[PDB]
Amino acid sequence: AGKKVLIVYAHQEPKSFNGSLKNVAVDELSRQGCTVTVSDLYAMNFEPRATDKDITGTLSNPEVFNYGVETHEAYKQRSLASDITDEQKKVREADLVIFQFPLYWFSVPAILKGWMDRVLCQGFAFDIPGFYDSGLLQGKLALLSVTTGGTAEMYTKTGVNGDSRYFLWPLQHGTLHFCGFKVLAPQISFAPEIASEEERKGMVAAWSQRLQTIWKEEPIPCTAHWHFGQ
Amino acid sequence: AGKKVLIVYAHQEPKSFNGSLKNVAVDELSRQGCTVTVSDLYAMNFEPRATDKDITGTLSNPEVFNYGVETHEAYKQRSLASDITDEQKKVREADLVIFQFPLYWFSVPAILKGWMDRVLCQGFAFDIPGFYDSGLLQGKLALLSVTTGGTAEMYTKTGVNGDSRYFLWPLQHGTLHFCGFKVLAPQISFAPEIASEEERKGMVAAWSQRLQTIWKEEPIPCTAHWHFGQ
Numbered sequence: 001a002g003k004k005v006l007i008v009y010a011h012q013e014p015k016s017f018n019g020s021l022k023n024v025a026v027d028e029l030s031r032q033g034c035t036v037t038v039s040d041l042y043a044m045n046f047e048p049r050a051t052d053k054d055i056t057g058t059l060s061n062p063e064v065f066n067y068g069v070e071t072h073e074a075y076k077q078r079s080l081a082s083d084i085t086d087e088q089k090k091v092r093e094a095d096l097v098i099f100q101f102p103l104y105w106f107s108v109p110a111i112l113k114g115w116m117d118r119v120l121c122q123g124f125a126f127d128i129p130g131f132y133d134s135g136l137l138q139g140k141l142a143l144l145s146v147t148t149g150g151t152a153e154m155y156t157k158t159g160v161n162g163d164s165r166y167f168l169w170p171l172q173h174g175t176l177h178f179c180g181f182k183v184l185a186p187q188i189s190f191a192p193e194i195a196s197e198e199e200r201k202g203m204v205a206a207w208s209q210r211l212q213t214i215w216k217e218e219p220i221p222c223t224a225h226w227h228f229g230q
Numbered sequence: 231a232g233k234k235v236l237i238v239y240a241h242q243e244p245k246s247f248n249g250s251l252k253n254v255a256v257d258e259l260s261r262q263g264c265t266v267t268v269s270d271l272y273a274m275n276f277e278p279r280a281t282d283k284d285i286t287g288t289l290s291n292p293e294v295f296n297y298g299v300e301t302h303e304a305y306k307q308r309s310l311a312s313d314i315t316d317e318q319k320k321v322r323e324a325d326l327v328i329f330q331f332p333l334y335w336f337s338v339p340a341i342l343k344g345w346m347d348r349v350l351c352q353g354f355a356f357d358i359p360g361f362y363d364s365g366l367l368q369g370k371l372a373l374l375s376v377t378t379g380g381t382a383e384m385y386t387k388t389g390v391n392g393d394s395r396y397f398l399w400p401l402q403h404g405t406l407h408f409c410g411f412k413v414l415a416p417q418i419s420f421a422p423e424i425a426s427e428e429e430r431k432g433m434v435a436a437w438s439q440r441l442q443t444i445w446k447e448e449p450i451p452c453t454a455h456w457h458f459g460q
């Protein structure tokens with residue numbers, strides 16, 4: 001019983017802290033005997049814009065363009081742009097999808113946001129009905145591995161940035177859970193630029209160490225209480 | 231004397247509900263005598279990716295590419311790509327920046343995320359000393375005008391999507407407030423696709439009417455309490 005992993009990676013520099021975290025994941029999961037695939041978005045020059053170029057067939061309404069409607073129809077007819085279907089194939093086969101990225105404005109870098117916007121279309125990732133616990137990617141695991149500029153202290157309730165879980169809401173709930181993913185606890189590597197050489201190596205080792213037993217983990221309760229308490 | 235407004239618009243279809251909200255804003259603000267500029271991101275084929283092409287000339291460290299450091303240095307040395315500087319000029323001169331967009335995965339469409347990632351660089355929108363209340367864009371007003379697929383009921387504390395204020399956090403606090411923007415109350419037009427014509431017309435009317443007294447509005451207390459508290 002093997003497992004397949006897709007790492008959607010979003011950093012411009014191979015020598016970056018993000019690059020090291022991505023490589024550590026490939027090394028550890030590969031060592032485990034897992035099947036591993038990496039979508040290096042910047043290297044792929046991945047298209048982030050949601051446009052009519054994403055559909056190649058006859059549009060449902062050539063007069064008024066509705067991205068959601070056209071992509072849902074294109075998915076069912078198999079007339080979506082190939083770059084989108086290539087990503088869907090990787091996701092469809094994956095047991096676990098890891099997103100590796102530096103936090104950009106309390107969210108994912110635009111190139112990765114584009115991957116989410118374009119790859120997770122209706123018909124593929126969810127249906128209406130067929131979302132949240134009934135999402136089409138149910139049975140699959142998702143995990144956000146994020147790096148930040150701000151420190152852990154800043155990312156606390158009384159901190160200037162608020163608790164780190166607050167900014168995970170759109171990603172974990174609005175996106176991943178909506179599509180049916182079981183969400184594993186996020187891996188947040190706080191302020192590596194401020195950290196020391198030892199601290200940086202420590203965060204990298206902690207990630208690799210966690211991956212050793214990632215398949216034994218339970219997903220988080222992706223609810224408002226988990227994210228905001230109250 | 232007078233007021234300058236920049237509308238950053240992110241929708242592919244001019245006939246869309248978003249297009250109508252953008253047009254009503256232009257009409258009303260223009261009628262008031264305001265100076266109005268619109269950045270139609272899709273029509274501009276606006277680049278969302280944060281890459282080394284955002285720096286003209288030669289990089290400060292061609293060994294290891296650090297987007298944040300490179301763009302900060304480029305800003306101070308007047309070596310940023312023209313598409314970025316064109317947007318910065320519009321923002322610098324604006325008294326109010328309205329973002330008009332459909333909610334994509336509890337956030338902004340990737341093309342607009344790209345505008346935020348690339349236009350709001352260090353040195354321009356903020357600096358080590360000036361962030362949040364001390365943000366470099368202080369004195370300026372920002373307003374998020376968003377449309378959703380989900381209904382208002384769904385966007386409640388106990389609703390499947392959670393309170394709408396939950397998804398505003400990354401945008402209003404992590405981005406706008408961080409840059410010094412005084413954040414005006416968001417304009418949320420819930421599920422125009424489900425609503426009836428009478429309701430749609432009502433939503434557009436409320437927007438136009440709100441615009442009549444926008445200069446009399448006081449900014450919201452962009453705090454964790456406002457977004458998550460009671």
Ligand SMILES: Cc1cc2nc3c(=O)[nH]c(=O)nc-3n(C[C@H](O)[C@H](O)[C@H](O)COP(=O)(O)OP(=O)(O)OC[C@H]3O[C@@H](n4cnc5c(N)ncnc54)[C@H](O)[C@@H]3O)c2cc1C
Pocket residue numbers: 011015016017018019020102103104105106107147148149150151192193197200201204280296297298346347348404
């Ligand atoms: C547009 C934009 C928006 C942003 N928004 C936010 C935000 O909202 N909130 C926030 O907190 N931050 C934000 N940031 C900060 C951003 O998260 C950091 O700048 C980013 O993490 C820097 O690159 P990264 O790879 O960590 O680290 P670098 O790549 O910065 O790595 C840090 C250090 O780690 C060293 N290193 C690399 N690999 C190893 C290794 N294996 N062992 C030991 N050391 C190693 C590097 O050489 C380097 O000195 C934003 C940045 C940008 C550009």
Ligand SMILES: Cc1cc2nc3c(=O)[nH]c(=O)nc-3n(C[C@H](O)[C@H](O)[C@H](O)COP(=O)(O)OP(=O)(O)OC[C@H]3O[C@@H](n4cnc5c(N)ncnc54)[C@H](O)[C@@H]3O)c2cc1C
Pocket residue numbers: 050066067068116117118174241245246247248249250332333334335336337377378379380381422423427430431434
């Ligand atoms: C990638 C993606 C991710 C998404 N993620 C989310 C999410 O996380 N959460 C969520 O809630 N939704 C989400 N959505 C739904 C999305 O927000 C809506 O589909 C979007 O708002 C639809 O277009 P819009 O312009 O409202 O409306 P249309 O453009 O859909 O407009 C609706 C109706 O308004 C009519 N209309 C236009 N102008 C006027 C006018 N002046 N007067 C009266 N009627 C008018 C139109 O003709 C149309 O019938 C997502 C969609 C996509 C494609």
Ligand SMILES: Oc1ccc(/C=C/c2cc(O)cc(O)c2)cc1
Pocket residue numbers: 105106149150151154161297298299301302350351352403404405408
């Ligand atoms: O080039 C850059 C562009 C933007 C940023 C933003 C950093 C930042 C750090 C925080 O702790 C909180 C926050 O909301 C934002 C850093 C570098």
Ligand SMILES: Oc1ccc(/C=C/c2cc(O)cc(O)c2)cc1
Pocket residue numbers: 067068069071072117120121122173174175178335336379380381384391
């Ligand atoms: O092409 C598309 C891709 C994604 C979506 C998502 C819709 C959606 C609607 C909600 O009420 C909540 C949510 O978290 C997501 C719609 C169309």
Ligand SMILES: [Zn+2]
Pocket residue numbers: 172173174177178221222223
């Ligand atoms: Zn959830």
Ligand SMILES: [Zn+2]
Pocket residue numbers: 402403404407408451452453454
């Ligand atoms: Zn705030």
